[PDB]
Each structure stands twice: as C-alpha cells, then as structure tokens.
Design a protein around this ligand. Structure first.
Ligand SMILES: CCOC(=O)c1c(C)[nH+]n(-c2ccccc2)c1C
Ligand SMILES: [Mg+2]
Ligand SMILES: [Zn+2]
Length: 326
C-alpha cells in the first residue's frame, strides 16, 4: 500500500536528528515505538547478534507500546519512540565510535524504550502529595521511574515476549543492572547531580588522537550512558522548531490537566500547570536556560565537536521562543 511505502521512506531518516516521528506515528497506525525499535534493531544487527526471534521482538514491542497511555498527551508511545531514536543517533556520535559493546548499546536502547511506560500523566511530586499507591509502594523516591522499570521488565514474561531468551545469564544480569541504572537516572530530581558529575568527567576527559572517548570502568561507562539517555529525554528543544513546538503543546496539555486535578483537590497548582496563569514562551526560555542548555553544552564538550549542530539548533529555538515574548 501507499501508506506502507511512505512509512518505509520516512524510516530511511532513522539515523538523522529531526526524524518526522509524528508522521511515522500516523502512518504506522499509532505504532511508532514498534516500527522505530524494529528498524533500529535491524540497522544495528541486534536480532542476529543476540539471537532474538523476530516474532518475539514484535510481540514484546507491541505489548510494551500498549502499556503507554493513548490519552496522555506527552508521556506516551510517541515520546518513547522519540527517546529511542534520539539515543540511537547519540550512540553513533563519532567521539563514541566503538566505545560501547553491543550489550551496552542494547541496554541503552531498551532502557529508552521502556523509560516512561505506564506513565499516568502526573509528576512524582503530585503522586507524593496525593498519597498515591505508587508513592506508598516506592517510599517517595523515583516513584515513576521505579514503576516504568518494573513494568518494562515484567512484560518480558508475557507469552513470546522474552527478547533476551538467548542471552547468557551473565549478559542478562549485566543488561538488567545497566537498564535500571539508566532509567533511574531519568528522574529529574537527579538532574543537578548527573550534570555535576558529567562536568567532572569532561574536565578529566581522556581521548585518542581522533577524539574518541576512552572509558574503562563501569562507573564512567554507565555515567555516559545515563547522561546520553537523559539528553535524549531532554532533546525536544534541540529538534527542528516544527517538532519542538508540537512537543511543547503536548507537555503543556499534560501539565494543565495535572493542574486541573490539583485545583479541584484544593492543592497548590504546580509550576507551569495553571492554564489560567500560564506563560508558555517564558517557561520554554527558562527551561532552556536553566536545564536543557547547561546539559547539552556539557554533552557537546564531552563529544566536541560532534554535537555542534544540535547545540546550534537549541540556540536557534531559544532565540525564536524569546522573540515571541513582547
Ligand atoms: C517540550 C517542552 O518540555 C518541557 O517544558 C518539559 C518540562 C518543563 N519538564 N519536562 C520533563 C522532562 C522529563 C521528565 C518530566 C518532565 C518537559 C518535557
Ligand atoms: Mg520519565
Ligand atoms: Zn521521558
């Protein structure tokens, strides 16, 4: 069909920053996570390397995708697909050439795929403040992120869903640890510590004559993978403006819905969640200045000069959003 042909053509840009992820979601019948993960697994030869039966991979991916909520505007399967594809591009950075093993690459991509699964569209702080069952279960720390992991791993146990069935026990143990370490690091309360440690690495950076990063121990390797997926998670402002604006519309819709719940419960409305007292453009400029740019400028220093085009786009978008403020 024409739809399947245009989808295949759009997926040819899977190695590019700025993939038309929304168009892919439309063309695939709302299966962007499944089609993008499958495409990436084939591109990186991951099915052959880890002896993953294709039917098992597709069954797991469709199941995983089904557990992202279609009525959550931002934290859904499209966001997951976007973070997966963004991580995939970051893994191909010239400065990281042949740095990570196939198992580490698998861990980073898998972590990206499950990183927000079963997200309810409300923040950790909302869950803590409302005395939710999730916050009770997880003792108020990385409430959502612990839950995303638990769901992502539990789904491997469904019928014909264990994509890691042919890995050795050691490979499985290592992958599981890496995935947990990466997803727990997506908790925004850990952003400042992650960045501080990334800065320390940049200052003590070691490279070959070609600028390829030399990372020997687990601590340094997982730290780079944690920051990589965190960057991918916070990559919306670094994408072509047309895409970024759509992401902004989506997070604002989600935030406003949380604010509506807070208002009717008589709670203080969280920052950026009050639809009656919002400043969307000022908030984006603040998000870039205080969080996104500091992180991306540091990442850019680590892999200099490979991320220059990403940083240039971020600054272009910041300039545009600022121009919309009278
Ligand atoms: C597209 C613009 O995005 C946002 O403005 C934000 C904010 C302010 N926080 N935020 C989150 C990032 C990671 C995890 C939860 C929220 C996003 C996407
Ligand atoms: Mg998250
Ligand atoms: Zn996310």
């Amino acid at each position: 069909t024409e739809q399947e042909d245009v989808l295949a053509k759009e997926l040819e840009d899977v190695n590019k920053w700025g993939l038309h992820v929304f168009r892919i979601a439309e063309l695939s019948g709302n299966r962007p996570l499944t089609v993008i993960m499958h495409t990436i697994f084939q591109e990186r030869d991951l099915l052959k390397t880890f002896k993953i039966p294709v039917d098992t991979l597709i069954t797991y991916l469709m199941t995983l995708e089904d557990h992202y909520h279609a009525d959550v505007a931002y934290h859904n399967n499209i966001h997951a697909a976007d973070v997966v594809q963004s991580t995939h591009v970051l893994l191909s950075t010239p400065a990281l050439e042949a740095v990570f093993t196939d198992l580490e690459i698998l861990a980073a991509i898998f972590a990206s795929a499950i990183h927000d699964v079963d997200h309810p569209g409300v923040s950790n702080q909302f869950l803590i403040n409302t005395n939710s069952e999730l916050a009770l279960m997880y003792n108020d720390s990385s409430v959502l992120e612990n839950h995303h992991l638990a769901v992502g791993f539990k789904l491997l146990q469904e019928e014909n869903c264990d994509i890691f069935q042919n890995l050795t026990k050691k490979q499985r143990q290592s992958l599981r640890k890496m995935v947990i370490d990466i997803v727990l690091a997506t908790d925004m309360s850990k952003h400042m510590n992650l960045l501080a440690d990334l800065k320390t690495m940049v200052e003590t950076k070691k490279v070959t004559s070609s600028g390829v990063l030399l990372l020997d121990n687990y601590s340094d390797r997982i730290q780079v993978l944690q920051n990589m997926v965190h960057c991918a998670d916070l990559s919306n402002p670094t994408k072509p403006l047309q895409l970024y604006r759509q992401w902004t519309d989506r997070i604002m819709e989600e935030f406003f819905r949380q604010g509506d719940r807070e208002r009717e419960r008589g709670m203080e409305i969280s920052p950026m969640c009050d639809k009656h007292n919002a400043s969307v453009e000022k908030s984006q400029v603040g998000f870039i200045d205080y969080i996104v740019h500091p992180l991306w400028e540091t990442w850019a220093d680590l892999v200099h000069p490979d991320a220059q085009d990403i940083l240039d786009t971020l600054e272009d978008n910041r300039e545009w959003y600022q121009s919309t403020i009278p």
